[PDB]
Design a protein around this ligand. Structure first.
Ligand SMILES: CCCCCCCCCCCCCCCCCC(=O)OC[C@H](COP(=O)([O-])OCC(O)COP(=O)([O-])OC[C@@H](COC(=O)CCCCCCCCCCCCCCCCC)OC(=O)CCCCCCCCCCCCCCCCC)OC(=O)CCCCCCCCCCCCCCCCC
Ligand code: HEA
Ligand SMILES: CCCCCCCCCCCCCCCCCC(=O)OC[C@H](COP(=O)([O-])OCC[N+](C)(C)C)OC(=O)CCCCCCCCCCCCCCCCC
Ligand SMILES: CCCCCCCCCCCCCCCCCC(=O)OC[C@H](COP(=O)([O-])OCC[N+](C)(C)C)OC(=O)CCCCCCCCCCCCCCCCC
Ligand SMILES: [Cu+2]
Ligand SMILES: [Cu+2]
Ligand SMILES: [Cu+2]
Ligand SMILES: [Mg+2]
Lengths: 52, 51, 105, 49, 77, 128, 95, 130, 102, 110, 172, 50, 221, 223
């Protein structure tokens, strides 16, 4: 149970890239899949897919 | 009485008709609500009169 | 969101959505994250505005909880996880900083 | 009995109380801007409750 | 708050107490509190100007204050 | 310690009295209890030295870990082995007849810590 | 609207004449209640304004009075120190 | 509900603060807060004269105090003399302190005379009617 | 059509609650960069941070001192609400060895 | 309506009461927080302040705004989340507050 | 309603007797019991008791007015549905007798909402009485005058009781 | 909205115990410190903790 | 402006003695009712901060606890528990300030575990159990390494202070006394809860029960 | 029961303190942080000492007013020697003057025959609402009231504030308490409790924080 290197807090460019990635992943949710915004959402969605 | 600061709040007389005091926010809200509750009956009241 | 700027979370915009996605739905840290979104509205893009917003987060954490002078300056890890609750000024500061990071424009 | 008395008596009473009795103020008070207001009559005595 | 009104007391004993406190404070603060023991109570100073208008007016008057200072110096030897 | 004011004297008396709870209650003994020969003072010191030697090995690893979960996991992994050895020691010391038996059991426990405990701890820390 | 629909909606019973006559009288019986309620609402607002002022500026005025009294003492102290300087010059001729 | 109260008195404004030297007092207090001085006696502009020991040794009481024993830093704050940093950052607030003291002295110089015929109805001029 | 309108309103509420991220992402792309920058500038508030004294007096020394870009406050604003973590002797020693800029 | 209300109550108040009945080794506080959140925080609370003008005059609204900002100061409160902000002006007229976020203290509306 | 509620009251009072004379500690907090359970059981009996006390008088007024007015009652089916709805909703409002004992806020909101919604079935009765009093051949009788007195008293009592479900007023 | 759900954010705590036919009010020791650490509104709505 | 503007001159005594105050007359504005308002100020103070009365027998200020109007008026002759007035502040400064809520304190056992219930009984039990665990760890080291040391050199705060204060806040003194009786009964026998606990073998699995607990958490800036 | 065993290995809890981002409360003399502890039972027969009661409270017992027999003069000693004996009475101008009357006679005449009228305020007519102590609290601030009862259910009922808190045995109910004005409120018990259900009065004085602090330092701090 080792640990990984913690990178320094991101600069503004890295924050903007993170925001862009989050919004692009937000755009991918089908409108007929009613999963709320939460930390586990994506995980839940994956689970749901497998369940289906 | 706390010096000349009259901390007393009720001053409720005998044959009192309403709330004991209106120095608290809850009772002020209740008094205003009751007055305006009695305001909104006119038409209904008038209706029954004619009946 | 009694401490934030907007009546409902939908007026916050994309930043509030990212704050919701950051923590689990029962985690009260989201509200603190929302305050970060409030601190970095016209400040994130300005190079010194970002530092000002981080200072605002530090002041907010110091005002919510009793804090010591060096306490918020010696945090080893500023990363947050889903189950991070605002039980300490360090957690409040981390949530506020994460909210600041997610404020585009 | 049904309409005129039940819809004007309390307003008349409050108006007379403020006009003549100064709403029952204890006048020996210092600063109006720092004193609570003696409210006019607000509990209707012509309603059963 | 419902604060009632009562004018300045001008009571003989109360104003004597307040004036003794005022004289002690004047003697202490005139030497930047270099006394061995300081008995001045600043708060009562406030009350001296709230309940002894006659003595306050005497103290403001230069001749009255000069007389008070001379008598205090004689008392203190 | 004599010269002090009333408040300081009362505080000193309080601090002294809070440490004599062991003294006051040593007179109240129970007849029906199962007595055992206690671990001797030198064996106590040797066991504490073994524990400090264990803490010497784990200190850099736990102080270089920034996650509380990892440190708690390291603590739990060692504690199971230590608890098995402690159970063996408690059984063999409670069932002891003389001080020689208690010394034998304490020495066995200390030797287990100093021989196998350090090896197990080193393996865990290398894993982390 | 629909006269037939509104003339037997209330449990097939007709009270439309009394409903029609109710509006005219009901248009005036509410005026004293409304005006006195306006008076009461203004009184409540004034009381809340006084509560806000006393909560905020109540403590501040007491500090201002405290500073006024301290300033009176300061003026008296300056005059007393001038007298002390004069007595330091005139060691005992002042008395 | 929506219009249950049927009226809202927006005409009545906030009570106007008509204190003599309130603005100067608040300005001086803000300035002193900027200095970040542990002693609270500095709140009064007359502190150098009322508590002169703040500039020499800080002994403002002759052991007649009840703030508990000196076990933590937040004890005997008035028994702590002003340091060089405190003195500097208080000197930076000297003009506002002087203006406050001048306002106080001018207010003290105001006396009630016989030409104040509007004394018995001074509430209206004080703007107490809303 | 009343049932259809009620169903549409219910679906709108459900979609607003559950697709908040997608809706906000779509809304953020309906305006260009300049418009969003202007809106952000209009909504910029201090929120009570660094609300130190603002000199309104014309002769105030702190007015010129604050106009100076090299002015150092005695303590940083976020540190004005944090408990001291050093002994009183250390505090007094540091303050007595302190020296003013300029 | 009554049946829907009762089903809503039993969904989040009765049944979740039985989820945790013993002390938990892992993330006990997390699980207890989950159970409590799905019950303590209700939707109506937000409206209770989103339309505060229905009974709060301007000055009473200002005083209750400072009071609410004080009373919901604690960060670890999921009920403070999902509650409409107190950093708002009275819809009819606002006396104390000139701008929404122009304060001298972060946790005080003035 | 009495058939539904009688066993609960019987169990509550039997438990009280056992607690008094056998020290079963049913309502003693020290070793497991809870005093609030007694209030829950008693009021679950008690509110339906007041409803079973009041409904037959509603029956009394609904017979005299049609008898003396020489016309059918305004709507008998709606009055029957109103009393049945009041009876059914009387089982979910007992907690308005226990607002201050420290019930969870969800329970208080449920009890208050259902208690306030009682005003709608009760208004149906008043409207039906008023509509049954019009457009008919009226014969003034002593039972009729007693019915009018009942109508006034019930109006006042019902309005005042509706006020009591306003939780903030109920605290005072 | 004003008289409930605010237990966490309170200046200090008082315990009211109702024995039969008189009341008992208890102030815990911590309250003392809680009364020493109280922000004060100084100047133009600026708060200071001593 | 000199380069030393704002620098305090050496030996500055902050003294205003012999100073011309006629130069500041343009830096402040006094309204026409300044003379009237001043009096009002004094009046209010004289009747608001005067919760003490001068006594002729003692010739000093005395006071008593807050009392109702009936007792002050119709029992003024029968006054009990008169204490000499000590002053609002020790140094005579002003204390009339508007107060607010101080910053909260860190929580070890959150209140949000049981917050739907207005009555804190399960929360009281939980907090006391956590404190009792911490105490079972440190109870016998208190007088040698913690608050109860003889000399302040080795003074350290007891590790369970925060949990103790949380448990005290959540529990009334009666329930706290019951729990202290239980704590004594379990500390006399040295009954650690881990010696008996087995219910984790009869509890449903959860995502939080994974063997790799440290790697379950995803960290993100 | 059983025994305190000869040796116990105790895990030091980690992360209970986050004051300065340190999760190791303990450190030995060598400087190495400690994860475990050894506890020994030296004496196998001695009893274990009871937990010392840390809790210390300022307790105010508010009971109904007790009738006086005589008006005792104010007496201050130097000890056992009367330094000053006086008969103070609070004058209408707020001065503790020396009374020229017989205070016992005034007390007994008020007790016997006092003038009353139809429209007499509750301030001047207190017969069931009198207590010997007052609960003093600050105004415009938040107080958590923990309500509980020793024996049976009572109701702390303040009509002026329009509040009522049910004190229930075994229930430590937390209430928020905010008073937005300076006020002296009387109150009663509003849950049937026995003989003195009627005579169970309450007096709560909400004061500004300066006056509350003066009361706290003068009457609360000395315990
Ligand atoms: C000649 C005719 C001229 C007509 C001109 C048009 C009318 C303009 C009216 C404007 C009023 C207004 O806006 O007031 C706001 C004003 C709001 O006050 P505010 O904003 O708080 O500040 C107060 C001001 O600073 C200071 O306010 P104030 O203290 O000076 O209050 C005075 C004010 C007080 O206002 C009133 O009195 C309003 C009118 C009351 C009702 C009039 C009769 C209506 C009857 C309807 C049926 C009832 C059943 O009165 C007026 O201004 C009246 C001006 C005209 C007088 C002549 C009217 C004759 C025809 C009436 C019809 O309202 C009040 O002050 C309310 C006070 C009165 C409450 C009700 C008193 C009793 C009413 C019933 C009387 C008897 C009727 C039944 C008889 C049989 C009984 C058994
Ligand atoms: C049979 C008698 C009876 C009846 C019919 C009712 C009917 C109602 N009661 Fe009553 N109640 C009691 C007897 C009764 N009650 C008793 C004995 C107690 C004591 C319990 C205890 O000791 O705690 C009690 C207690 C009690 C309480 C608790 C008080 C407290 O806790 O001590 C409450 C509120 O929570 C309440 C409410 C209601 C309501 C909403 C109705 C509704 O059913 C009323 C329905 C009527 C309407 C709402 C329609 C009104 C008609 C109009 C058209 C209104 C317009 C008219 C005008 C404006 C005048 N009741
Ligand atoms: C929910 C419903 C409630 C009401 C339902 C019905 C039941 C109650 C019925 C009451 C009936 C009236 C009783 C009171 C009668 C006196 C009125 C009174 O004193 O009111 C007090 C009010 C208020 O008096 P006040 O000014 O002293 O107010 C009280 C003031 N305080 C409280 C401060 C002390 O007085 C008036 O309103 C006086 C003016 C009206 C006078 C009317 C006189 C003429 C009557 C005409 C009758 C009809 C025509 C006849 C023609 C014949 C031709 C031949
Ligand atoms: C439903 C009841 C409707 C009738 C109510 C009759 C009046 C009841 C009462 O005592 O009201 C108090 C009111 C008194 O109002 P009040 O008690 O608010 O008086 C305010 C003035 N102080 C407080 C100084 C006393 O009584 C009346 O106004 C009487 C008017 C004449 C009634 C004649 C009836 C025949
Ligand atoms: Cu009921
Ligand atoms: Cu009782
Ligand atoms: Cu009782
Ligand atoms: Mg009850």
């Amino acid at each position: 149970g080792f640990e990984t290197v913690v990178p320094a807090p991101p600069t503004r460019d890295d924050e903007l890239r993170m925001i862009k990635a989050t919004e692009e992943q937000f755009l991918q949710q089908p409108r007929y899949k009613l999963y709320m915004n939460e930390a586990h959402r994506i995980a839940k969605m994956n689970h749901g897919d497998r369940h289906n | 009485m706390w010096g000349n600061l009259w901390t007393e709040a009720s001053y409720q007389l005998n044959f009192n008709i309403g709330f004991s005091s209106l120095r608290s926010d809850v009772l002020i809200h209740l008094a205003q609500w009751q007055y305006w509750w009695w305001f909104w009956f006119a038409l209904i009241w008038s209706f029954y009169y004619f009946i | 969101m009694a401490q934030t700027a907007h009546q409902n979370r939908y007026q916050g915009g994309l930043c509030y959505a990212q704050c919701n996605e950051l923590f689990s739905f029962w985690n009260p840290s989201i509200q603190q994250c929302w305050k970060g979104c409030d601190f970095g509205v016209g400040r994130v893009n300005d190079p010194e505005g970002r530092i000002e917003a981080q200072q605002m987060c530090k002041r907010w954490a110091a005002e919510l909880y009793w804090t010591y002078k060096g306490e918020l300056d010696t945090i080893k890890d500023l990363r947050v996880h889903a189950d991070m609750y605002p039980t300490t000024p360090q957690n409040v500061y981390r949530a506020c900083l994460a909210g600041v990071r997610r404020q585009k424009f | 009995i049904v309409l005129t008395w039940g819809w004007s008596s309390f307003q008349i009473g409050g108006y007379n109380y403020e006009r003549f009795d100064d709403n029952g103020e204890r006048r020996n008070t210092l600063y109006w801007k720092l004193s609570p207001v003696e409210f006019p009559q607000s509990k209707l005595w012509n309603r059963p409750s | 708050m419902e604060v009632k009104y009562r004018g300045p007391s001008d009571d003989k004993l109360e104003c004597e107490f307040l004036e003794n406190n005022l004289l002690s404070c004047l003697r202490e603060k005139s030497v930047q509190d270099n006394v061995a023991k300081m008995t001045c109570r600043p708060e009562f100073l406030v009350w001296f100007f709230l309940e002894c208008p006659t003595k306050a007016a005497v103290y403001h008057d230069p001749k009255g204050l000069r007389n008070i200072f001379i008598q205090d110096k004689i008392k203190q030897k | 310690v004599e010269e002090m004011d009333t408040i300081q004297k009362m505080n000193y008396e309080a601090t002294v009295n809070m440490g004599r709870q062991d003294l006051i209650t040593r007179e109240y003994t129970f007849y029906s209890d199962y007595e055992f020969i206690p671990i001797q003072e030198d064996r106590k010191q040797q066991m504490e030295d073994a524990l400090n030697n264990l803490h010497k090995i784990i200190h850099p690893t736990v102080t270089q870990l920034k996650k509380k979960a990892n440190v708690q996991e390291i603590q739990d992994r060692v504690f199971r082995k230590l608890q098995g050895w402690e159970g063996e020691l408690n059984t063999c010391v409670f069932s002891a007849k003389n001080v020689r038996d208690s010394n034998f059991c304490a020495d066995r426990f200390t030797n287990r810590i100093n021989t196998e405990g350090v090896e197990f701890v080193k393996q865990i820390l290398r894993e982390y | 609207r629909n006269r037939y629909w509104w003339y037997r909606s209330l449990y097939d019973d007709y009270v439309a004449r009394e409903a029609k006559l109710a509006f005219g009288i009901a248009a005036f019986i509410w005026l004293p209640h409304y005006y006195w309620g306006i008076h009461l609402n203004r009184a409540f607002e004034v009381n809340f304004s006084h509560r806000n002022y006393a909560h905020e500026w109540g403590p501040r005025r007491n500090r201002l009075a405290h500073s006024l009294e301290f300033e009176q003492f300061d003026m008296i102290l300056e005059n007393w120190q001038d007298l002390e300087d004069e007595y330091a010059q005139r060691g005992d001729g002042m008395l | 509900a929506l219009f249950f109260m049927a009226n809202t008195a927006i005409s009545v404004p906030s009570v106007l603060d008509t204190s003599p030297c309130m603005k100067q007092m608040l300005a001086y207090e803000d300035c002193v807060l900027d200095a970040n001085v542990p002693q609270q006696e500095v709140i009064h502009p007359q502190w150098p004269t009322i508590w002169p020991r703040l500039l020499t040794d800080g002994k403002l009481l002759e052991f007649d105090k009840v703030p508990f024993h000196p076990e933590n830093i937040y004890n005997y704050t008035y028994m702590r003399p002003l340091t060089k940093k405190n003195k500097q950052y208080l000197y930076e607030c000297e003009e506002e302190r002087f203006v406050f003291k001048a306002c106080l002295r001018k207010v003290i110089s105001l006396k009630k005379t016989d030409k104040h015929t509007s004394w018995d109805t001074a509430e209206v001029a004080n703007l107490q009617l809303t | 059509v009343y049932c259809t309108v009620l169903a549409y309103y219910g679906w709108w509420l459900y979609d607003r609650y559950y697709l908040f991220g997608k809706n906000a992402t779509q809304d953020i792309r309906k305006d260009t960069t300049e418009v969003w920058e202007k809106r952000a500038a209009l909504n910029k508030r201090n929120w009570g941070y660094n609300a130190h004294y603002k000199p309104e007096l014309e002769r105030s020394m702190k007015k010129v001192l604050y106009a100076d870009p090299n002015y150092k406050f005695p303590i940083e604003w976020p540190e004005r609400y944090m408990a001291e973590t050093k002994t009183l002797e250390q505090v007094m020693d540091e303050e007595e060895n302190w020296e003013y800029y300029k | 309506v009554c049946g829907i209300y009762v089903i809503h109550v039993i969904y989040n108040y009765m049944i979740p009461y039985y989820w945790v009945s013993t002390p938990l080794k892992n993330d006990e506080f997390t699980r207890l927080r989950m159970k409590d959140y799905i019950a303590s925080t209700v939707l109506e609370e937000v409206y209770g302040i989103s339309y505060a003008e229905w009974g709060w005059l301007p000055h009473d609204f200002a005083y209750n705004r400072m009071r609410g900002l004080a009373g919901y100061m604690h960060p670890d409160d999921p009920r403070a989340m999902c509650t409409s902000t107190f950093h708002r002006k009275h819809k009819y007229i606002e006396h104390e507050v000139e701008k929404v976020g122009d304060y001298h203290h972060m946790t005080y509306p003035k | 309603m009495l058939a539904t509620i009688t066993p609960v009251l019987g169990a509550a009072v039997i438990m009280m007797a056992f607690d008094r004379h056998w020290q079963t500690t049913f309502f003693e907090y020290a070793y497991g019991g809870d005093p609030i359970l007694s209030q829950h059981l008693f009021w679950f009996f008690g509110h339906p008791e007041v409803y079973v006390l009041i409904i037959p008088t509603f029956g009394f007024i609904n017979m005299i007015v049609p008898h003396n007015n020489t016309r059918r009652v305004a709507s008998k089916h709606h009055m029957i549905w109103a009393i049945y709805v009041m009876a059914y909703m009387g089982y979910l409002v007992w907690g308005h007798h226990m607002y201050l004992v420290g019930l969870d806020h969800r329970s208080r909101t449920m009890y208050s909402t259902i208690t306030i919604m009682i005003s709608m079935p009760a208004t149906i009765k008043v409207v039906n009485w008023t509509l049954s009093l019009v457009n008919g051949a009226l014969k003034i009788d002593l039972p009729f005058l007693f019915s009018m007195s009942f109508l006034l008293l019930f109006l006042v009592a019902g309005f005042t009781g509706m006020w009591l479900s306003h939780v903030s007023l109920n605290v005072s | 909205r004003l008289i409930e759900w605010q237990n966490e954010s309170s200046l200090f705590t008082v315990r009211v115990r109702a024995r039969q036919w008189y009341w008992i009010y208890k102030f815990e020791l911590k309250n003392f410190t809680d009364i020493l650490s109280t922000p004060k509104n100084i100047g133009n709505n600026r708060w200071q903790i001593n | 402006l000199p380069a030393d503007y704002g620098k305090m001159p050496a030996g500055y005594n902050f003294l205003t003695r012999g100073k011309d105050w006629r130069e500041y007359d343009k830096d402040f504005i006094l309204r026409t009712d300044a003379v009237w308002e001043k009096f009002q100020l004094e009046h209010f103070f004289r009747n608001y901060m005067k919760c003490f009365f001068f006594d002729h027998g003692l010739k000093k200020y005395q006071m008593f606890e807050p009392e109702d109007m009936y007792t002050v008026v119709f029992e003024g002759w029968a006054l009990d528990d008169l204490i000499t007035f000590p002053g609002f502040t020790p140094t005579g400064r002003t204390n009339s300030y508007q107060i607010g809520l101080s910053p909260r304190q860190r929580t070890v056992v959150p209140t949000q575990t049981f917050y739907q219930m207005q009555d804190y009984y399960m929360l009281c039990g939980l907090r006391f159990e956590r404190w009792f665990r911490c105490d079972l760890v440190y109870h016998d080291q208190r007088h040698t390494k913690f608050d109860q040391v003889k000399n302040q050199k080795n003074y350290k705060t007891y590790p369970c202070y925060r949990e103790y204060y949380e448990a005290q806040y959540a529990c009334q003194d009666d329930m706290f006394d019951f729990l202290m009786e239980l704590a004594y009964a379990r500390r006399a026998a040295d009954n650690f809860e881990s010696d008996f606990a087995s219910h984790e073998l009869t509890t449903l699995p959860t995502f939080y029960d994974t063997p790799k607990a440290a790697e379950r958490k995803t960290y993100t800036y | 029961p059983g025994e305190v065993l000869p040796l116990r290995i105790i895990k030091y809890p980690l992360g209970l303190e986050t004051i300065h981002n340190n999760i190791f409360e303990n450190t030995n003399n060598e400087g190495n942080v400690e994860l475990f502890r050894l506890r020994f039972n030296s004496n196998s027969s001695k009893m274990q000492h009871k937990l010392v009661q840390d809790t210390i409270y300022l307790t105010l017992k508010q009971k109904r007013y007790n009738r006086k027999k005589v008006v005792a003069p104010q007496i201050k000693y130097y000890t056992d020697l009367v330094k000053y004996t006086g008969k103070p009475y609070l004058s209408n101008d707020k001065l503790l003057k020396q009374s020229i009357y017989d205070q016992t006679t005034q007390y007994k005449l008020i007790k016997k025959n006092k003038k009353r009228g139809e429209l007499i305020p509750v301030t001047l007519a207190r017969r069931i609402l009198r207590t010997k102590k007052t609960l003093v609290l600050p105004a415009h601030v938040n107080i958590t009231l923990i309500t509980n009862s020793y024996d049976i259910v009572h109701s702390w009922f303040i009509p002026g504030l329009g509040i009522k808190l049910d004190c229930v045995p075994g229930r430590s109910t937390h209430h928020t308490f905010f008073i937005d004005n300076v006020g002296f409120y009387y109150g009663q018990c509003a849950e049937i409790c026995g003989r003195y259900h009627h005579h169970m009065p309450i007096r709560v004085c909400a004061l500004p924080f300066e006056h509350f602090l003066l009361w706290w330092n003068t009457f609360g701090l000395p315990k």
